[PDB]
Design a protein around this ligand. Structure first.
Ligand code: HEM
Ligand code: HEM
Ligand SMILES: CNCCN(C)c1cncc(CCc2cc(C)cc(N)n2)c1
Ligand SMILES: CNCCN(C)c1cncc(CCc2cc(C)cc(N)n2)c1
Ligand SMILES: C[C@H](O)[C@H](O)[C@H]1CNc2nc(N)[nH]c(=O)c2N1
Ligand SMILES: C[C@H](O)[C@H](O)[C@H]1CNc2nc(N)[nH]c(=O)c2N1
Ligand SMILES: [Zn+2]
Lengths: 404, 405
């Protein structure tokens, strides 16, 4: 049985058949749905089968499926697993695998872009120092003077005999969070733990709200090392508002490059524990979540007071009013600085086009509705009205435990 | 540790475990292979007895008499009744318990903090379509209460073997007509096109406004549905104005005070009440965001944004978000002015979090549909956005049922 998927705005119905290609179970059972949970509660034969399936995927994608190059390649993989317990990917295969991982990421609204991804092979990396070099080039390439380009750098895969290559930071750019004795937090509350780990490993702390953290980089079975990014590498956008002169006074800012550095990339059963990837922001990530979440910078009441709003009652919708001006500020400021950004309406409309492309290409598209629908103005966007099917395809980005 | 779903709040960092889901007997649409949680509508003899036995156990527990002699005698009384007739009857207070528990169990309802405060009108004696009309008018009168809205449900006779159903054809007691135009467009509410055409086929003389109140199509057992027009003074409405945008009132928008769902099935202990309309009060985003701004409903966003003189030629001006906010404010302001009960999406979600905490202590969980609980605007500004939820089906329940035609 294949899920029947309906759009409630248009009346149109599709059938997801791609989900039958899922080999990995999610958190739901027929007794109870667990789709709103953020994290999971969580053999040569099995590695070999994921390898076969992936190699078949690759040769099918270049329409050389069944051919001699294909046959001989499966033989290589099988021969290599049989005597070493593992294998290695060709650069071309890794490029394919990385693009598919993005394509398959059900929580990502930006997947219209999935075929345009620059892949840096960093598998010849043997130290934190080289990782840092690779990371710096990635940032320079990706940022491209505000003309953002999507990229991934892939460090050496996990191996049975040793500890992982890891980037301890959750993103390549993070603002420090400084825990106060008086309970509160200066800077980004989301980054208290990593800030403290940086200090413990000997970083000289700042005292600002927007102090860019150093990277903690780890080569196998070694203590992590500390590397400060050259400030000229981290593009930042001061936030002002198009018609509210006082907004700029607030001294708000955000960095240009969203670069996730703590997820695991799995391809054909191989696991890449350090494989930082980046694109460009959707404005609501900065304007709504990072700046307005109560457990983040939490600036809503501040902005509302400057707007002289009735802060004393919920029914004046001050929160809603302030959040809209904040999101507008982010868009205006990024556009003024010529740094790539996408608003949530433009993003969700392109995501609808992606669904349509994928329906035609693959018979469906794994999508996590709760993460696709923006944090403000949900039903004002087309994705709100679109039913979606969530499931796990490989290659995939996965979460993994923090390495401390 | 515990072998039940771990549930996390990401704002507060706090953890619970849902043990109540263990009580679920009916399977939802998901499997380990794929999550179908965002689908609005996914695809008796011994059976009856087990559902019946379970409900009576629920009832006696609610009154703290499990295992008692009255408990076992009621169980005996029920199976005796099923053995000789195939069905059975609820005592009055069982029906009252069941109706409240059905609301309490409703995963898509954010208003469940009020669940214990429900007026239950017993209408299981009703025997004509004219009589259904009297019960409905009475319900509307009681529930509207001149703007001081009171939750209520009226329960009509249960499905009976052989005999036909009591059905209310309309999806709500109050519904604006949707008139399909020559040019293909719709005047009024596009959601109500079919029911409008059904009323007409059954002899209603149609109007031509954006806000014409539909007559009721009420159906008694094995009879064609009869048509009934509500006395306009029984249908309380609120004209919409804005607290500072003076032109907003000139738009001629309005909404009715009483949201009363009339097409759902109430199931208790295997017994099915095919007509059992229930009503509460509105959360403002239902009117202001969904009914007025959905592209496939009234679709007024562009009208308002033009009046607000916003740049509607580019998404990045956030004209849609700006207009939606003011439309929601107008709804809240106009209901407040008219002294008609309403709740904003902030107050409502805050009260739902309190409800989740009450239920965690009372029952060890609360079935909840995250996509439906989180409001259609300002999602992450409300605390439920940061709350993981477990969705599952408990009974008593309100269920969807096929349209009777
Ligand atoms: C090009 C512009 C892109 C945009 C606008 C975009 C947008 C987004 C957004 C809004 C989210 C939700 C994030 C959150 O709320 O925490 C997300 C998640 C995600 N994105 Fe994209 N993305 C882009 C590029 C990429 C690229 C290049 C990759 C990988 C190569 C990627 C992979 C992912 C993954 C794996 C997630 C899920 C993260 C998680 O589960 O925490 N995205 N994206
Ligand atoms: C007292 C104030 C109440 C409020 C603010 C409230 C709020 C809501 C809201 C906002 C929804 C979402 C509906 C949609 O978006 O289509 C909903 C659904 C629902 N409500 Fe409540 N409600 C209230 C009272 C009641 C009562 C008295 C009952 C029954 C006794 C009830 C039962 C339900 C059920 C069964 C649904 C699911 C409807 C569906 O799945 O289509 N509610 N409610
Ligand atoms: C669920 N735990 C981790 C959350 N996480 C990895 C995360 C948190 N906050 C923000 C992001 C940014 C995600 C992202 C990635 C890319 C490539 C582009 C973009 N605009 N956003 C990710
Ligand atoms: C999704 N299928 C059913 C449609 N449906 C029942 C529905 C649609 N649109 C709006 C409502 C209103 C739901 C409701 C019910 C009650 C008692 C109170 C309230 N505030 N809202 C219901
Ligand atoms: C509990 C809930 O699932 C959680 O708050 C989710 C909701 N949807 C989200 N959507 C996005 N894009 N990012 C998020 O962090 C979240 N958080
Ligand atoms: C596809 C999606 O499930 C559908 O549009 C849902 C989303 N959440 C909703 N939430 C509520 N309260 N009411 C709705 O009608 C919907 N529609
Ligand atoms: Zn699910």
């Amino acid at each position: 049985k294949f899920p029947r998927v309906k759009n409630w705005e248009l009346g149109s119905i599709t059938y997801d058949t791609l989900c039958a290609q899922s080999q990995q179970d999610g958190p739901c059972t027929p007794r109870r749905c667990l789709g709103s949970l953020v994290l999971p509660r969580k053999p040569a034969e099995q590695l070999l089968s994921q390898a076969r399936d992936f190699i078949n995927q690759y040769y099918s994608s270049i329409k050389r499926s069944g051919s001699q190059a294909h046959e001989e390649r499966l033989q290589e993989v099988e021969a290599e697993v049989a005597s070493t317990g593992t294998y290695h990917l060709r650069e071309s295969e890794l490029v394919f695998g990385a693009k598919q991982a993005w394509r398959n990421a059900p929580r990502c609204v930006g997947r219209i872009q999935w075929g345009k991804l620059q892949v840096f092979d960093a598998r010849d990396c043997s130290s934190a120092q080289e990782m840092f070099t690779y990371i710096c080039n990635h940032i320079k390439y990706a940022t491209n003077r505000g003309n953002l380009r999507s990229a991934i750098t892939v460090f050496p895969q996990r191996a049975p005999g040793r500890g992982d290559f890891r980037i301890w930071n959750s993103q390549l750019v993070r603002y420090a969070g400084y825990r106060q004795q008086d309970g509160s937090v200066r800077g980004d509350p989301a980054n208290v733990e990593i800030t403290e780990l940086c200090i413990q490993h000997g970083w000289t702390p700042g005292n600002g709200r927007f102090d860019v953290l150093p990277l903690l980089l780890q080569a196998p079975d070694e203590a992590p090392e500390l590397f400060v990014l050259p400030p000229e590498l981290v593009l930042e956008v001061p936030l002002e508002h198009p018609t509210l002169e006082w907004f700029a006074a607030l001294g708000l800012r955000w960095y240009a490059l969203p670069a996730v550095s703590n997820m695991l990339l799995e391809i054909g059963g191989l696991e890449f524990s350090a494989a930082p990837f980046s694109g460009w922001y959707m404005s609501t990530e900065i304007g709504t979540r990072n700046l307005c979440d109560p457990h983040r910078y939490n600036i809503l009441e501040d902005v509302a007071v400057c707007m002289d709003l009735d802060t004393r009652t919920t029914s004046s919708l001050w929160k809603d009013k302030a959040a809209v001006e904040i999101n507008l500020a982010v868009l205006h400021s990024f556009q003024l600085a010529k740094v790539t950004i996408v608003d949530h309406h433009a993003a969700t409309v392109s995501f609808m086009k992606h669904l349509d492309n994928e329906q035609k290409a693959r018979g469906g598209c794994p999508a996590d509705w709760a993460w696709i629908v923006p944090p403000i103005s949900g039903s004002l966007t087309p994705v709100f009205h679109q039913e979606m099917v969530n499931y796990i395809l490989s290659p995939a980005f996965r979460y993994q435990p923090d390495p401390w």
